[PDB]
């Protein structure tokens, strides 16, 4: 029963190049599709701000964190698609949000092979953790019908942008 407040993303958003499709930049929902193919367009059509795969539990996670915190409008992350064996990227991303990172850049509680953030610092991680108000765990789910329902549920709960400027973290 509300009109959610909105902010301008960083100029050029998404600034970090990668494998994703861009949607409505004022959408409050981002979607990570892990190891699956073919889910991205449907997520954008459902209303996502951005949707794309995430293969590695280091660089992959950094590019997602960097492109979400440069857009204050994004308040939800949906994790869906097949888990990556060895990388276990979905579990690593959940652990980042739940626990943060160590002094060494290691994701606390992560089960993947190389869960280290070399470029994304403690301040950027804490911005990610207060900007994203909820992580929706649909890990290993490839039902586009369920995933789109999750997207619309988030959109109906839009709490508006975080009241901070875009956060710019430089990657490699």
Author numbering: -1 to 170
Q: Could you give the paper's own sentences about this structure?
A:
In the methanogenic pathway from H2 and CO2, the membrane-spanning methyl-tetrahydromethanopterin (CH3-H4MPT):coenzyme M (CoM-SH) methyltransferase complex (MtrA–H) catalyses the exergonic methyl transfer from CH3-H4MPT to CoM-SH (ΔG°′ = −30 kJ/mol) coupled with endergonic sodium-ion gradient formation. Here, we report on the X-ray structures of the B12-binding domain of membrane-associated MtrA from Methanocaldococcus jannaschii and of the MtrA homologue from M. fervidus in complex with cobalamin. Analyses of these structures reveal a cobalamin-binding site that differs from other B12-binding proteins in an unexpected manner and also provides initial hints of how the energy of cobalt demethylation is transformed into conformational energy used for the ultimate sodium-ion translocation process.
Primary structure analysis predicts MtrC, MtrD and MtrE as integral membrane proteins with at least six transmembrane helices, MtrA, MtrB, MtrF and MtrG as peripheral proteins with one transmembrane helix anchor, and MtrH as a peripheral protein without a membrane anchor. Membrane-associated MtrA devoid of the C-terminal transmembrane helix was over-produced in Escherichia coli 20 years ago in a soluble but cobalamin-free form, and the holoenzyme was reconstituted by unfolding and refolding in the presence of cobalamin11. However, cobalamin appears to bind less tightly to isolated MtrA than to MtrA in the MtrA–H complex. The structure of cytoplasmic MtrA complexed with cobalamin and the structure of the soluble domain of MtrA without cobalamin were essentially identical. This finding suggested that the MtrA structures observed in this work were relaxed forms.
